[model samples]
Target chain A: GFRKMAFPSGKVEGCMVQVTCGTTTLNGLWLDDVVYCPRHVICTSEDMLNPNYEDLLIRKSNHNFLVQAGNVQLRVIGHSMQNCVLKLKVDTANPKTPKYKFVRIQPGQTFSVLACYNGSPSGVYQCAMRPNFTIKGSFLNGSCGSVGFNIDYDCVSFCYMHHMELPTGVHAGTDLEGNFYGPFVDRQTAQAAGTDTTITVNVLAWLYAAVINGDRWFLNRFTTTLNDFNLVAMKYNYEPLTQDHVDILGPLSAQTGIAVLDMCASLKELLQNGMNGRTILGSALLEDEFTPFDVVRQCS
Target chain B: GFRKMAFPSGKVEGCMVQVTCGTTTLNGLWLDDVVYCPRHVICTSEDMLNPNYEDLLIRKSNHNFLVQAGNVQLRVIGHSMQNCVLKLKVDTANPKTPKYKFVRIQPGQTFSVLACYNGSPSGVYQCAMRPNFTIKGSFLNGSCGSVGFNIDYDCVSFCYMHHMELPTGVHAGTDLEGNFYGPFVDRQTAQAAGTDTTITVNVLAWLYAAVINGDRWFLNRFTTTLNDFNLVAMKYNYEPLTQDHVDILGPLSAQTGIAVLDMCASLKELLQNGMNGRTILGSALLEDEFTPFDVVRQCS
Candidate 1:
């Protein structure tokens, strides 16, 4: 049966909900078999979540802000969730395994529900973020109506597995320009020599924004049981633009249609002379007040 | 700028096209900033071809079938792509480095376009599949109208990175039932003693079907430079249903609403006696001809 929402739906008129298994989160309505949301920031199209899309739940925090009402004008009164219950096809929805083959979750809780991923994040194994557990919940609306949530914790078939079958195997594979790259270092061989293996990898990591520095070097960009730091790296120093440097290239970028990330990738070049003692000055926000300028993580 | 298709559009009415990115494929339409498909199987919704979505070009193959007749659909003569040209924003769309920060492709070619993924396939980094290189193309229709294609070769920033960091690292985390599992092993230490390592990953791999199996062992479920074989494995053996297995479980499944993958999970369990010496027979067709049963790689 197709999951349709004739229901009191829409993010504001109806309710809000999210179903998460592992790092993948899909709008509750997308699971059509279990729940449905007609439209709401909460019920995002699967592409924006799951093995892909970014989360907007934080933006929804703005809604919760509507709580400290001013009428902010609640010349009308206000409301909140009065009571909530999560329904589980699987008893307790906290079981390790299903009653044989069942479905899984909880709302307003961070505990993960168990579930199965069809394949890796690259989507090589294209499978649904199917439920090993199914938990349904209904919340009493305090006139403001309400929202429910479904989360699968301890999710499975997802892990940053290691397959360094060979550190030497990487020495192969050359770029057409005759440059070599790969995570082929001897932290193992060096350690075997029995010393502190604190070797700094010689490559530019794709991490930026460091004024918060004082104590950090490489930014741990990915966190996963199955993490990937591919034998991939670009050679260049990320030179945050100085006003002086920008004055020169920003104009050319327009004429040449070159993107800033491309033009400012290397520090040793681009207005190298103008940078004698110049540094770009930027003030900070709580990281949320605004979005970045035409964002990208690195240069070509 | 958004990619739009106001053209001779729609799957049947418009031209057909696709852009292959590593394992990920996107409808030429979804690339929005680039080409567009008003509606066509060739231009599928990204959710259907990307980090998730399955490919539909095969169905497009059905469209090619129209070429064979006289009003059997054609009524007129026939048509096909006459001249194909792939335009590259990057010279040859095959260069090794960007002249600072430029872009990167070809057409009608399988070579992957080298590009930067904002992050991993899971989208942890939440970056766009930005083109380090961008290629444009146009194909002349045998009038009956036209279509074109764009392909990228030697793409990067995607690798099934190894993060085993430690095999023993997995031995920790405990499931609610206290069942401890991890892929921590002595393959390395064992190899030091010098022996052929032939260990069957104790897993119910998501692979099924046997007639075409004279050579394959595990279906090599995933292939990547950073492939993931999570320290994770499901215990239930996949027991493809016997007509007998179904008679009992299928009926109960409907009542219990259990999915086939769940009900027919293990051989030693569920209808164990009835399955003795019994075999289920099936017919064959080109692998492309059809899909499989409710299709899931596992039982429970």
Candidate 2:
């Protein structure tokens, strides 16, 4: 009914256990039906994970960083919505040494990092990173005597989602100029002919991110099956759809329709399989390592 | 940000004026955006209005009963979700005479009622009514002279909507038994070949009610274009499908698809037009006059 937490000795006491419901994840402590968390990074309210509140699960990661660890090397397998700059940080508790780097990666890219302890005693080491600035972290407390441990760090190139509490009404190209605003701009260019690859790419990237983050809220931003698009293509050098215009726009609509279908499928899958919560260390350690900037800025 | 209120002499002083958002009608009052209601038939939280919580807006009515003038003869106009037993109550402020009646009406149907005072002194009178069991009441402070004031009573044959607080997540033929359950069952039958008129009628009636009520939540229950139907069909006699099943079940899918589109359109219209809140007199007056039985009963 709520979040679960486990408290270890000194390493981030009372680490929050990740609780998943459908595609959404919840953090903090749970007693009965109430969620208690003085602070939470993903979603503060436990209600967000409920399918009824699916609209509240607003964030999505544009990349998936599958980190694998061995005694001496740390490997990261990455998948992204497109291309972005991802930062990495590896810290050692035993030697008090910090190793960090930045890498440019494209969609579906993979990379690795390794560290070897020559004389230092075996102890714990941590690795964390994310796209832009938002971060995700993991700790490996395995021994690293000769076969220095290889810790995996799941990081992303970038991830984005809406601010909590979007307004009640249907938003078009942009959100209403008031509270309940979201980061995504529902703007679609009405091309006379040919597809707007930019929109296509954005939608696809967003869909991919939604799937990875299991963020159903992010997927709904696309007005696929939803009626009415607060359409705005004038300033962007486009026009609204006309019956004649629609015939030629089939390809673009089809592309978007497929994306919608895919997203719908993803939602069904999540509903069927259930959500997986985030690890407490990941919640506490990755504060601000990655940035989820507003799409208005990205659009401009 | 909230509801407004106006108090007359003593009858429910400072009575609240309901605020409408989409199909859901908010009651009593709002101060600084918070809904203040000693009693609300629908959702009390403001978040319920947000599209994020659109599923919570559980009611909509086509008629607005604004009874005015000194009372003499009582008059009523009606509308309904479908054929339902509507009970009426007309009481005098001074003599305290109780006048009541019952009538049956169907969706899109309209009718009127009238009662004239003969021997009593000219004064104010009130009228109210609701379908099934729910009730609605109103007040008229007019002096009934020789030509006795014709008090127009806004009574409807039937108005349909849910009770409120539907549970989150995928529901089967019927939702898990609980308070959060809704009046509409999320059920669909699998017809090997041919349309389920039961589903069709239920969906149509619900859609009509939603349109009249401006119920986005009601519309959403269709899951028509929502990419999946395994959603409920099983355990009840339906299976989920993809593009392939959709290809074969073209007519059925198309029918449901149209319903979904229509519902989506209705939502857009409601959102754009904005909802009209319920009146305190209306809320109180309509109590026990109507019943929102679960869709299962309706389907069966």
Candidate 3:
């Protein structure tokens, strides 16, 4: 089959979904321009292109309000692909495989999907919608094959993979057979950011890892062991992972960073409660949503 | 009904409700207390209280990890009589209702009800517990008039009630309400408290009342108009909540002297996105779980 060369990169869906039912005629009601209809308020093409659109995409609809909800639906143009399927990759500070799976977009050519903010919330979100890709084709040309590897058509999975078990202080002081370790030293400092205050943790990683079984990731987890490192956007952390540890920006302000961050989690992994915590890694090169670092090393 | 001059309270029938159908029993495996039951542990407790412990309390016990769960049960023992019920006001900040409501004990019996960190999370909670009073009657020289009142047993019902809408400018203009608001302004500054950051938030009452028709809860809401205004803990703009307003706390290392707050809402009020953007009225006193301010007017 004939296909263009646009590898699906970036997130296809934002952390939020909008559902509009009832007899309400709303316009400009959109979750990144995956609009609800009748009034078809201007979610606008410009709204879709902006990377920060999710933050600015206001509900200029006439009905009532904008919200983060459970089981909701929006009426759209009656078409064959009325139902939209939105897939989002939710990340968490404490990285691990998310428990549940599956989210719904509307039904019909224009329908709503079932989505709930059951897990932690990402302070930020990126969502989008396209005619649920129905085009069936083969990798005929080298272009499709060239960029074809880029498209991850299936839902994020973690069935067949391996990595070092990132050490926590609880894991460090304990024997390898033990599941939990720590009783590590307190190396945290206080930081201020506008109105939010969080403690910044800077651990003694080398010393900690020396006495503990720390984590190390092989670039081959995504590819094959024989393949060279694909050092695109990835970083390494000599620092261990913990809820207390966060990233420090400016002088006294600390932002968030990735700790054992796996992009394979579901949308629910990203949602957080209480206050926000930020983190950063030691390696300046590795793939991540923030401070994209690439780990460059030859096989031992 | 010759009710004793007494109180009413309940406790679990056994020391604790233990389930033992799985491989392990649930002990103190924290993290919201979720632990894996290796062999599908299943356990149930007998309902000693006619209301059923499950009706008033939520118990999740897994015997797979803690083999002793099968022998566990909650024993609720308290006195029921004509007494006085003191009503204390609270909101989401206080996860539980009046501290005295849940404590169960005999007249001389002393135990402890769990202390709340108010979601702010205080140290491990352990304190004394006393049976709640329904009515206290004294036969002083054969007194005639009896003093007794109905009990407000709907404790958790009031935990989420004092809610209002949160406006956009809630984080603009001032350090909290302006572009100077976050990421840095709120990280933990001291290294010793680990990474727990301290922050402040100044909130305005009219933002939701006037703008969002949030149903005002101002000076008129309180039955006992606080006599001492010095202890006033919150401040909000009334003459139309605007962004260009003067915030009380002049300045600090970061935006300090404001309320360290947490907002709570319900599925009924949340927008489709699960948010209504409102500042709920928590404890009248300054609470880390509630935003802070000093009021100037008695009714304003």
Candidate 4:
């Protein structure tokens, strides 16, 4: 009996299907530098020795940009080559800081690192492109075109503050029913206001009133409520919480060691169970409550 | 015989101008608890103990908004009293950084610091009032009204790029006279072109060309020229450089450790006396030039 099989050599139509011939190895037959076997078996030396050139080509082509905590993470995939090492140089790093990351990867491996990419406070992420290189001792094995990613933080922050409640007593003056009506009540309300007042002014005034009046009860409730709103808005609207949210809603200065978010959380914890006027007593309350020592531990 | 002189108790006008009478002791006699002498030799206890209180009051009262390289330095005067300390908490500090400065002053002293009091970045400087206190077992000595300062960077960047030169080959396509016509040629040429391109787009493009082309020569000349323009504009027009100037002109990221002024100075030094392309050979010069290693010493 004979079986039909194709070989790397001239295509052989008929081949013996016997046990001895089936197991036989055609070790020396070569085509395109690949060994040919009798039983339709083929082994490419390129794939075995170098491994995954195709996969490496695909990997080397991939470039991804991810953002975390107002910072960016650049992921560069590596290609398959002998001694192939992928190195990424992020241009935004300060001269004082290390700006390059190197990863030795099998042809189709990936390396990701948090980068110094930051858009402006206005959401326009403009900076130098991240350059990727495949390195092997004074030679560039390969390189990917330097590319940049612009994550429009514009719409992103809109969603963050969209459903969120403005600080108490902002443009949302008190009502008889004890309900609040601020600039960002909803789409309709914000539009009717003719201007957006759920701005930094309202937020700052809200903070000032709490500190001035020593209104711990309101401070605690407001803090808890605002952060809660942030969580809920983030979950429902498919928008994620970002550092901008922290900067805008939380404290502006890092020296305080308390973000507005943490400021809210801390106040919530500090006044959650305390009676009003108990902790804040005496005339020095104004100065003491406002000191960093009272809020930021290291500041004291 | 004891010399007789007028005292706070009696307004006696007719007094003898004699050495023997002038030696009379008006000491140990306290008016307002301050020692008084016959010849109007008076020493107030307030001045010696706290010489700078009035100066502190004047300083605290001085709410100046001085512009420095697109940033503002908030100078708050310090007060005098043994326990009277002045604490300035800038609300602009991020949560991870320190934002508070404390100064202990005798009566009338002044202290100043560069602050993150950026207004357009956000009109929110929320920190405890620059608190001045007399610290005697945490007793309230005195207090000044809590104040906030708004520093606007909006109009600041306007003058920076006002008189800039275009790249070698931008909209600079020459007409019959071989005259360059680009975004920042003189107003007369821009008007004659019938296409007003002196807008944000052109400025952005100019910056883009500088970064992409690694035209340090253009950058140096431009920086020097722009700074010169800024000085003239500031002197005559009273318009100062702002943070926007830094943001738009310098590396936008604060983390880059290169302020706008420094960015200009660095570029000036980098291309000052060097030949273009002599140092840059082989490889993509864009990546090499833009890398932090090239600009920042620590990065190398």
Candidate 5:
């Protein structure tokens, strides 16, 4: 009998599932991958040399608006295996007196982590702008192993800004609080001209680049929490996280370090309100479509 | 002739002036000290025993409501010195995989730092809830120095959450956005009762202690930013930092690490709105009494 991962309904579902439903093209290849229905991992791909991509390879998809505002997703793809060993570790500092940590993880699992601890299999999380978080993993050859040694984990839990340019006629800023905005002067001016750009401009990667060096003007612009997708993305229409927003460059900051973070659950963490101080993961499943409320697969 | 610390006024004033203009008492010692007019450090205490104190000491004054919702102030007192080398460094991990940094600093100077660098004399700063920031300094007998060696800093600038009970039958939470709140149940109830606290209750050291562990329901309570003093301190009375709010304990969590943080400015940085992403320091002055707009003396 194959073991099934039972994601507790609603109340607990978000803590265990992630979905990447949509059509995507990468490096010249198209993947119309959608997890309409989830599949449980029960077997491994044969032909040790089968095009069976790394069963435990990791990939991240980032958000256009959200990332422009706060976080993204880190997925662990088990291309083909049941009990392959996944080793993980985290380190720090840019090298001036370093720090490190080993992770305790499980496949088909989800977690919420604080940006603190460098995503070092720890919680106790940030004023997290470009935090020092990084989660790294390795594919080991363990058990599904015998103990006296160790059987490993089945549970766990957790978990800035700046701005950048958006597609045509756009540029925005955000306050790690899920709100994105266009230039304040322009938006106010546009509204003064009597019109606000309709929200929901869909750009695959609302990629942003820092315009000014050594500037925190991004957090300075807004005072009231406007998770308003447009303001952050600025009159720009936004695409919601179809649950496939991966952190291609890792969630923290590329300037910070290198590390791959992983988590599973129907629900993903947000810099938005709720969530207990980013300490104890969010209890209420983010009812918004923006949250990856259902688990899906990351096709290799 | 001696060296004079000239704080540029107005635009640059906020970066150098911090005033604590009231009377204070600590451990039964009454110090009716006020830096009514600024002073230039001219010489050292001769008696050495002039009750000289640790002229080169550090103290922090936290906001009643601010601490409840956001941040506090860290000041360094140079009791007496012509050229003291302030050796500073930062570290992490709680011991697992640690990281570190050494700071470069100066007296009577100011800076804005990113909490990301853990207050390692760096800026470029947090979604801050009890961040990992801890700026440590040392008072050495290094005579300022010549450039074959580092003459240390003269420039630079930088730079959460949770809730707790406030005094006066009150309690509150903050988004670290400068907004604080009373219990949603109580506030809404009170609003239902058609009344909000007068928003100004002055109490020195509005100390708050954690009531709930493993809970961040505190953040879940608000959305639109509310730097309102009342909600955060919740019907509680709060005292502003009079340039003398010393952190008996360090600025970071007493649990996180052991270290002192330092900064100087007229417009003290706010966890509130408007600061360039907590980086490049706020260009505009924080024109509020709540902000220690004028630099004052920390009596030895």
Candidate 6:
């Protein structure tokens, strides 16, 4: 039969509630099935909380944030569930303030019930109920008057196993283009060594930002990942702009069509020039804020 | 800028030819970045050459298939690509029967140029090109036979990437459960020693097969991912039915349900106990070519 939402003949409206798994905390947490249905609970459509989506239950303690029942119990079963602990928190409704409380799970246990009073009033109350593991997460809402929280503890644990097999003659080190670039790039670069030819990679950490004595680099002119690094281009020796160097290139980018490098070629320039000398000075532009220079120049 | 496609301008389409990648042994392979133009002929979409989707190419072999041309070469860049090779087949039209030839790539590299063949009724010639790492596809159709071939090979290095991560505490093991259940389970028996009740994991493999298996397992029984495994009652055990066993469950299920375990049990008994097992025992049932009855008895 289709899992229609219409209540079964003798099914009580709020009598037998379906207990949801606990939610993850800010750092790491595990949760079970937890859902709240006041009247119509349809298991067919997606509106029902199917733990598969991992949508956190934002429980606010305000009077308007109502709950028909005061306490709820959920369980973990068998030798399969030994040392894990669950973290809990109070998610507040108001903005003025936020606060949190934390708890741990017992080993080899089956179930636990939480009460409404476990939540805070002024700030957001969010807790990550961790089982068997160390507890971590924030429960307090900031500056806002009401208690609220940002419980972002999402958790999962799995290990993938692969045969340590390699294709014939393609030894590990032979395919690894390591410090040839530097310390390391990310996972994609590690996977591409033996296979990709057109792409050359540089570890982001080794990128010299101090070479130009802290000038920014430009990157808009690049058509591909490798195009940004050619040393002989007209813009070579200039700073190469990147996400961090956007400020210097933001205004002058139209003139050059790319980001300029910020650092000097080497310390030789600093040995001759002195500490206070700078090639260019500009204002910081954040996604939240920006400065226009044309108007200032017009007034001047 | 948006990815734009344009026809080869001016008098002639130079450095152009069709590059066919993949084989038709079983699954139809895909050719990416093919520039299909009317002038650059290849057949329109159709399935000729058995399972190949080549007939779908309207012009079959012409200048139309080159989306962007400059000496761009294919490189094997992902781990999934290995041992796969490509053959360059060229033709004036996507011939019902193509007169084809083979091509090979220069060693140690994946990109190369076609040794310039004139677009003429040239006897169907094959190039010796295989996917060194990646394949090149271009087209040529002038005086060539109605069907000619110049194949370019590409490896099925990567079909898709995974998004989920694996879990903690539980290293890879097989003895605990006969099957390798993914990173974590829903509070079953084995998860005892871990501290944090929840796990942090990457579930990539699970996401992949889940799509196919979920569809097969549920057979439209539930609508959402949450309900699939959670709804314990819907799980089919495949059992054999006595008249009474059918009566009580029938009224509740409304739909005629299969006894998964029971059928398996029945089939096993018949194979071992013969007619005394109450299976459909008959001399006529033995036709030698027999479909496995356990699965169908419950499903069919």
Q: Write the per-residue lDDT of candidate 3 for residues B1-300, one digit (tens) a residue.
A: 000011111111011122223332222101112211111112233221122322322233221222222333312121111111111111112221132222222211111111111111110101111111111111111111111111233221000000001121011000101111112121112211112211112223211211122223331211211222112222211122122222332221023222211111111112123222232221111112111221111001
TM-score of chain B of each: 0.17, 0.18, 0.17, 0.18, 0.14, 0.17
Give the lDDT of residue B174 in candidate 5: 27
Query: What is the clash count of model 2?
Result: 61
lDDT of 4 by residue, A60-133 (tens): 33232121112333232321222121222222322222121211222111111101111111101111101111
Q: Model 4 segments beyond 4 Å from truth?
A: A1-93, A96-118, A122-299, B1-300
Candidates 1 and 4 compared: the better one by DockQ is 4
Best by DockQ: 5
Error of 1 at A182 (Å): 10
Q: How do the candidates rank by lDDT, highest first?
A: 2, 4, 6, 1, 5, 3
The DockQ for candidate 3, computed on C-alphas, is: 0.01
Q: Clash totals for all models, in order?
A: 43, 61, 129, 25, 85, 179
Local distance difference test scores for all models: 0.19, 0.22, 0.18, 0.21, 0.18, 0.20
Off by over 4 Å in 1: A1-168, A175-300, B1-300
Deviating ranges (above 4 Å) for candidate 6:
A1-171, A175-256, A259-300, B1-300
TM-score of 2: 0.17
Candidate 4 chain B worst ten-residue window by lDDT: B1-10
Model 1: per-residue Cα lDDT at residue B268: 22
lDDT per residue (tens digit) for residues A1-300 in model 1: 000001111111111234232333322211111222111213233532231112333333322312111112111122111111111111111112211111221111111111112111110110111111111111111101122212122222111111111221111111111111132221123111111111011011111222211112222232211011111112222212334333433433454443334423332231223222222211110111111211111111
DockQ comparison, 3 vs 4, better candidate: 4
Of the true interface contacts, each candidate retains a share of: 0.00, 0.00, 0.00, 0.00, 0.00, 0.00
TM-score of chain A of 2: 0.18
